[PDB]
Amino acid sequence: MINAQLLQSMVDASNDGIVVAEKEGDDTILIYVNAAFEYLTGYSRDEILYQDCRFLQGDDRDQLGRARIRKAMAEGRPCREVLRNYRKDGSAFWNELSITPVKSDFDQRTYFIGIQKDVSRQVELERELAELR
Amino acid sequence: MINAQLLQSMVDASNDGIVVAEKEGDDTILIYVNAAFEYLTGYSRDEILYQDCRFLQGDDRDQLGRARIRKAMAEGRPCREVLRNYRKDGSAFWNELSITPVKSDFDQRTYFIGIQKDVSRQVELERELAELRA
Ligand SMILES: Cc1cc2nc3c(=O)[nH]c(=O)nc-3n(C[C@H](O)[C@H](O)[C@H](O)COP(=O)(O)O)c2cc1C
Protein backbone atom coordinates (compact mmCIF):
# COMPACT_ATOMS: atom_id res chain seq x y z
CA MET A 1 0.00 0.00 0.00
CA ILE A 2 1.90 3.04 -1.39
CA ASN A 3 1.00 6.71 -1.26
CA ALA A 4 2.30 9.91 -2.88
CA GLN A 5 4.31 11.14 0.09
CA LEU A 6 6.15 7.85 -0.13
CA LEU A 7 6.95 8.42 -3.84
CA GLN A 8 8.41 11.76 -2.90
CA SER A 9 10.50 10.12 -0.19
CA MET A 10 11.78 7.64 -2.78
CA VAL A 11 12.78 10.50 -5.11
CA ASP A 12 14.51 12.21 -2.18
CA ALA A 13 16.35 9.04 -1.19
CA SER A 14 17.86 8.92 -4.66
CA ASN A 15 21.62 9.02 -5.02
CA ASP A 16 21.63 9.86 -8.68
CA GLY A 17 20.48 13.41 -9.30
CA ILE A 18 16.92 13.74 -10.60
CA VAL A 19 15.42 16.67 -12.51
CA VAL A 20 12.30 17.55 -14.45
CA ALA A 21 12.36 19.98 -17.40
CA GLU A 22 9.76 21.37 -19.81
CA LYS A 23 10.55 22.26 -23.45
CA GLU A 24 10.38 26.01 -24.33
CA GLY A 25 11.43 26.13 -27.96
CA ASP A 26 15.17 25.56 -28.02
CA ASP A 27 15.51 25.90 -24.26
CA THR A 28 14.44 23.16 -21.80
CA ILE A 29 13.87 24.78 -18.46
CA LEU A 30 14.15 23.11 -15.06
CA ILE A 31 10.98 22.89 -13.02
CA TYR A 32 12.17 20.36 -10.47
CA VAL A 33 15.44 19.24 -8.86
CA ASN A 34 16.15 16.74 -6.04
CA ALA A 35 18.74 17.16 -3.27
CA ALA A 36 21.24 14.75 -4.84
CA PHE A 37 21.40 17.09 -7.86
CA GLU A 38 22.20 19.99 -5.59
CA TYR A 39 24.98 18.02 -3.87
CA LEU A 40 26.32 16.80 -7.20
CA THR A 41 26.37 20.28 -8.73
CA GLY A 42 26.61 22.65 -5.80
CA TYR A 43 23.68 24.75 -6.95
CA SER A 44 20.55 25.30 -4.85
CA ARG A 45 17.05 25.06 -6.27
CA ASP A 46 16.20 28.74 -6.76
CA GLU A 47 19.63 29.28 -8.24
CA ILE A 48 18.89 26.96 -11.17
CA LEU A 49 15.12 26.62 -11.30
CA TYR A 50 13.53 27.69 -14.61
CA GLN A 51 16.75 27.68 -16.60
CA ASP A 52 18.17 25.32 -19.16
CA CYS A 53 20.73 22.85 -17.85
CA ARG A 54 23.50 24.05 -20.25
CA PHE A 55 25.01 26.05 -17.39
CA LEU A 56 26.44 22.78 -16.13
CA GLN A 57 28.58 22.59 -19.26
CA GLY A 58 30.00 25.98 -18.27
CA ASP A 59 32.36 27.37 -20.92
CA ASP A 60 32.36 23.93 -22.57
CA ARG A 61 29.69 23.72 -25.24
CA ASP A 62 31.42 21.81 -28.00
CA GLN A 63 30.51 18.34 -26.87
CA LEU A 64 29.28 15.59 -29.20
CA GLY A 65 26.50 14.69 -26.79
CA ARG A 66 24.60 17.95 -27.18
CA ALA A 67 23.54 17.24 -30.78
CA ARG A 68 22.23 13.75 -29.96
CA ILE A 69 20.39 15.08 -26.90
CA ARG A 70 18.58 17.67 -29.05
CA LYS A 71 17.74 15.04 -31.71
CA ALA A 72 16.30 12.68 -29.12
CA MET A 73 14.34 15.65 -27.68
CA ALA A 74 12.69 16.32 -31.01
CA GLU A 75 11.76 12.69 -31.75
CA GLY A 76 10.24 12.39 -28.29
CA ARG A 77 12.72 9.71 -27.42
CA PRO A 78 14.78 8.57 -24.38
CA CYS A 79 18.54 8.92 -24.52
CA ARG A 80 21.67 8.42 -22.44
CA GLU A 81 24.87 10.44 -22.94
CA VAL A 82 28.13 11.08 -21.05
CA LEU A 83 29.09 14.72 -20.72
CA ARG A 84 31.60 16.85 -18.82
CA ASN A 85 29.94 19.15 -16.31
CA TYR A 86 31.26 21.72 -13.90
CA ARG A 87 30.10 22.46 -10.35
CA LYS A 88 29.26 25.87 -8.91
CA ASP A 89 32.77 26.26 -7.45
CA GLY A 90 34.15 25.11 -10.82
CA SER A 91 35.07 21.48 -10.06
CA ALA A 92 34.87 19.10 -13.03
CA PHE A 93 32.81 15.89 -13.05
CA TRP A 94 31.70 13.27 -15.55
CA ASN A 95 27.95 13.05 -15.86
CA GLU A 96 26.00 10.11 -17.34
CA LEU A 97 22.71 11.74 -18.24
CA SER A 98 19.43 9.98 -19.03
CA ILE A 99 16.55 11.87 -20.46
CA THR A 100 13.20 10.16 -20.49
CA PRO A 101 10.34 11.93 -22.24
CA VAL A 102 7.06 11.31 -20.46
CA LYS A 103 3.72 12.79 -21.38
CA SER A 104 1.78 14.30 -18.53
CA ASP A 105 -1.87 13.30 -18.65
CA PHE A 106 -2.99 16.49 -16.84
CA ASP A 107 -2.23 18.90 -19.73
CA GLN A 108 -1.05 16.76 -22.63
CA ARG A 109 2.41 18.33 -22.54
CA THR A 110 5.60 16.28 -22.63
CA TYR A 111 8.04 16.67 -19.75
CA PHE A 112 11.56 15.35 -19.63
CA ILE A 113 13.05 13.46 -16.73
CA GLY A 114 16.82 13.63 -16.26
CA ILE A 115 18.90 11.22 -14.24
CA GLN A 116 22.45 12.31 -13.48
CA LYS A 117 24.85 9.57 -12.48
CA ASP A 118 28.34 10.58 -11.45
CA VAL A 119 30.73 8.22 -13.26
CA SER A 120 34.00 10.08 -12.81
CA ARG A 121 35.68 7.05 -11.25
CA GLN A 122 34.61 4.72 -14.06
CA VAL A 123 35.96 7.24 -16.54
CA GLU A 124 39.29 7.63 -14.84
CA LEU A 125 39.64 3.89 -14.27
CA GLU A 126 38.95 2.73 -17.81
CA ARG A 127 41.17 5.57 -18.99
CA GLU A 128 43.91 4.25 -16.71
CA LEU A 129 43.31 0.71 -17.96
CA ALA A 130 43.75 2.13 -21.46
CA GLU A 131 47.10 3.60 -20.48
CA LEU A 132 48.20 0.38 -18.79
CA ARG A 133 46.90 -1.66 -21.74
CA MET B 1 3.57 21.96 -9.17
CA ILE B 2 4.83 18.55 -10.39
CA ASN B 3 2.33 15.67 -10.68
CA ALA B 4 2.06 12.39 -8.80
CA GLN B 5 2.52 10.81 -12.22
CA LEU B 6 5.73 12.69 -12.74
CA LEU B 7 6.93 11.38 -9.33
CA GLN B 8 6.09 7.83 -10.36
CA SER B 9 7.83 8.20 -13.72
CA MET B 10 10.89 9.58 -11.88
CA VAL B 11 10.96 6.41 -9.75
CA ASP B 12 10.47 4.33 -12.88
CA ALA B 13 13.26 6.20 -14.73
CA SER B 14 15.76 5.32 -12.02
CA ASN B 15 19.02 3.56 -12.93
CA ASP B 16 19.36 2.09 -9.48
CA GLY B 17 16.85 -0.39 -8.19
CA ILE B 18 14.58 1.14 -5.53
CA VAL B 19 12.51 -0.63 -2.86
CA VAL B 20 10.32 0.27 0.14
CA ALA B 21 9.96 -1.84 3.24
CA GLU B 22 7.69 -1.68 6.29
CA LYS B 23 8.68 -2.97 9.74
CA GLU B 24 6.81 -6.23 10.28
CA GLY B 25 7.23 -7.53 13.79
CA ASP B 26 10.92 -8.39 13.60
CA ASP B 27 11.40 -8.22 9.81
CA THR B 28 11.28 -5.66 7.07
CA ILE B 29 8.94 -6.81 4.36
CA LEU B 30 8.83 -5.30 0.84
CA ILE B 31 5.81 -3.21 0.04
CA TYR B 32 7.26 -1.69 -3.15
CA VAL B 33 9.91 -2.38 -5.77
CA ASN B 34 10.60 -0.46 -8.99
CA ALA B 35 11.38 -2.19 -12.31
CA ALA B 36 15.10 -1.48 -12.19
CA PHE B 37 15.16 -3.68 -9.11
CA GLU B 38 13.26 -6.50 -10.87
CA TYR B 39 15.64 -6.73 -13.83
CA LEU B 40 18.71 -6.24 -11.62
CA THR B 41 17.61 -9.21 -9.49
CA GLY B 42 15.81 -11.33 -12.07
CA TYR B 43 12.83 -11.75 -9.76
CA SER B 44 9.50 -10.23 -10.72
CA ARG B 45 7.13 -8.19 -8.55
CA ASP B 46 4.69 -10.98 -7.79
CA GLU B 47 7.55 -13.28 -6.75
CA ILE B 48 9.06 -10.98 -4.15
CA LEU B 49 6.54 -8.42 -2.89
CA TYR B 50 5.66 -8.68 0.87
CA GLN B 51 8.78 -10.61 2.02
CA ASP B 52 12.07 -9.65 3.74
CA CYS B 53 15.00 -8.84 1.47
CA ARG B 54 17.27 -11.47 3.03
CA PHE B 55 16.64 -13.66 -0.04
CA LEU B 56 19.17 -11.75 -2.18
CA GLN B 57 22.25 -12.81 -0.21
CA GLY B 58 21.67 -16.38 -1.42
CA ASP B 59 24.25 -18.88 -0.26
CA ASP B 60 26.27 -16.52 1.91
CA ARG B 61 26.43 -15.51 5.58
CA ASP B 62 25.75 -12.40 7.66
CA GLN B 63 28.93 -10.30 7.35
CA LEU B 64 29.52 -6.77 8.69
CA GLY B 65 26.78 -5.79 6.34
CA ARG B 66 23.90 -7.93 7.61
CA ALA B 67 24.58 -7.24 11.27
CA ARG B 68 25.16 -3.50 10.86
CA ILE B 69 22.16 -3.26 8.53
CA ARG B 70 19.94 -4.90 11.15
CA LYS B 71 21.48 -2.67 13.79
CA ALA B 72 21.01 0.64 11.94
CA MET B 73 17.56 -0.62 11.10
CA ALA B 74 16.66 -1.23 14.72
CA GLU B 75 18.32 2.07 15.59
CA GLY B 76 16.39 3.90 12.85
CA ARG B 77 19.65 4.94 11.25
CA PRO B 78 20.98 5.08 7.65
CA CYS B 79 23.47 2.53 6.39
CA ARG B 80 25.39 1.79 3.18
CA GLU B 81 27.01 -1.56 2.40
CA VAL B 82 28.29 -3.48 -0.62
CA LEU B 83 27.20 -7.14 -0.89
CA ARG B 84 27.37 -10.07 -3.26
CA ASN B 85 23.89 -10.90 -4.49
CA TYR B 86 22.44 -13.43 -6.91
CA ARG B 87 19.97 -13.14 -9.77
CA LYS B 88 17.31 -15.80 -10.45
CA ASP B 89 19.53 -17.56 -13.00
CA GLY B 90 22.29 -17.65 -10.38
CA SER B 91 24.29 -14.74 -11.74
CA ALA B 92 26.51 -12.91 -9.24
CA PHE B 93 26.57 -9.14 -8.86
CA TRP B 94 27.96 -6.52 -6.49
CA ASN B 95 25.12 -4.54 -4.88
CA GLU B 96 25.75 -1.18 -3.31
CA LEU B 97 22.81 -0.86 -0.99
CA SER B 98 21.74 2.22 0.92
CA ILE B 99 19.00 1.89 3.50
CA THR B 100 17.31 4.95 4.87
CA PRO B 101 14.56 5.06 7.51
CA VAL B 102 11.75 7.49 6.65
CA LYS B 103 9.36 9.33 8.87
CA SER B 104 6.82 12.09 8.47
CA ASP B 105 4.75 9.31 9.73
CA PHE B 106 1.06 9.80 9.53
CA ASP B 107 1.13 6.02 9.51
CA GLN B 108 2.33 4.38 12.75
CA ARG B 109 4.58 1.81 11.08
CA THR B 110 8.02 2.78 9.88
CA TYR B 111 9.28 2.64 6.32
CA PHE B 112 12.75 2.06 4.95
CA ILE B 113 13.86 3.05 1.46
CA GLY B 114 16.57 0.88 -0.06
CA ILE B 115 18.66 1.80 -3.08
CA GLN B 116 20.40 -1.05 -4.84
CA LYS B 117 23.08 0.10 -7.33
CA ASP B 118 25.08 -2.39 -9.45
CA VAL B 119 28.80 -1.65 -9.03
CA SER B 120 30.24 -4.93 -10.39
CA ARG B 121 31.95 -3.35 -13.38
CA GLN B 122 33.57 -0.51 -11.45
CA VAL B 123 34.78 -3.21 -9.08
CA GLU B 124 36.26 -5.44 -11.83
CA LEU B 125 37.97 -2.54 -13.56
CA GLU B 126 39.46 -1.31 -10.35
CA ARG B 127 40.62 -4.86 -9.62
CA GLU B 128 42.25 -5.04 -13.01
CA LEU B 129 43.84 -1.57 -12.76
CA ALA B 130 45.20 -1.92 -9.25
CA GLU B 131 46.44 -5.38 -10.11
CA LEU B 132 47.99 -4.21 -13.44
CA ARG B 133 49.79 -1.50 -11.44
CA ALA B 134 50.86 -4.01 -8.82
C1 LIG C 1 15.63 17.01 -18.28
C2 LIG C 1 16.95 17.42 -18.87
C3 LIG C 1 18.06 17.43 -18.06
C4 LIG C 1 19.29 17.80 -18.56
N1 LIG C 1 20.37 17.78 -17.73
C5 LIG C 1 21.62 18.14 -18.17
C6 LIG C 1 22.71 18.12 -17.30
O1 LIG C 1 22.56 17.78 -16.12
N2 LIG C 1 23.96 18.49 -17.76
C7 LIG C 1 24.12 18.87 -19.08
O2 LIG C 1 25.24 19.18 -19.48
N3 LIG C 1 23.04 18.88 -19.94
C8 LIG C 1 21.78 18.52 -19.49
N4 LIG C 1 20.69 18.54 -20.34
C9 LIG C 1 20.88 18.94 -21.77
C10 LIG C 1 20.89 20.46 -21.88
O3 LIG C 1 20.08 21.04 -20.88
C11 LIG C 1 20.41 20.87 -23.27
O4 LIG C 1 19.00 20.77 -23.40
C12 LIG C 1 21.09 19.99 -24.32
O5 LIG C 1 22.47 20.28 -24.38
C13 LIG C 1 20.52 20.31 -25.69
O6 LIG C 1 21.59 20.81 -26.46
P1 LIG C 1 21.78 22.40 -26.58
O7 LIG C 1 22.39 22.88 -25.29
O8 LIG C 1 22.70 22.74 -27.72
O9 LIG C 1 20.43 23.06 -26.73
C14 LIG C 1 19.43 18.17 -19.88
C15 LIG C 1 18.31 18.17 -20.72
C16 LIG C 1 17.07 17.80 -20.21
C17 LIG C 1 15.86 17.79 -21.07
Ligand SMILES: Cc1cc2nc3c(=O)[nH]c(=O)nc-3n(C[C@H](O)[C@H](O)[C@H](O)COP(=O)(O)O)c2cc1C
Ligand atom coordinates in the same frame (compact mmCIF):
# COMPACT_ATOMS: atom_id res chain seq x y z
C1 LIG D 1 14.23 -1.10 2.30
C2 LIG D 1 15.18 -2.25 2.48
C3 LIG D 1 15.87 -2.72 1.37
C4 LIG D 1 16.75 -3.78 1.51
N1 LIG D 1 17.42 -4.24 0.40
C5 LIG D 1 18.30 -5.30 0.51
C6 LIG D 1 18.98 -5.75 -0.63
O1 LIG D 1 18.81 -5.22 -1.74
N2 LIG D 1 19.86 -6.80 -0.50
C7 LIG D 1 20.07 -7.39 0.73
O2 LIG D 1 20.87 -8.32 0.82
N3 LIG D 1 19.40 -6.94 1.86
C8 LIG D 1 18.51 -5.89 1.76
N4 LIG D 1 17.82 -5.42 2.87
C9 LIG D 1 18.02 -6.02 4.22
C10 LIG D 1 17.37 -7.38 4.36
O3 LIG D 1 15.96 -7.28 4.49
C11 LIG D 1 18.00 -8.01 5.59
O4 LIG D 1 18.01 -7.05 6.62
C12 LIG D 1 19.44 -8.34 5.23
O5 LIG D 1 19.45 -9.49 4.41
C13 LIG D 1 20.27 -8.61 6.47
O6 LIG D 1 19.84 -9.86 6.93
P1 LIG D 1 19.64 -10.14 8.50
O7 LIG D 1 19.51 -8.83 9.24
O8 LIG D 1 18.35 -10.92 8.63
O9 LIG D 1 20.84 -10.90 9.04
C14 LIG D 1 16.95 -4.37 2.75
C15 LIG D 1 16.26 -3.90 3.87
C16 LIG D 1 15.38 -2.83 3.72
C17 LIG D 1 14.63 -2.32 4.91
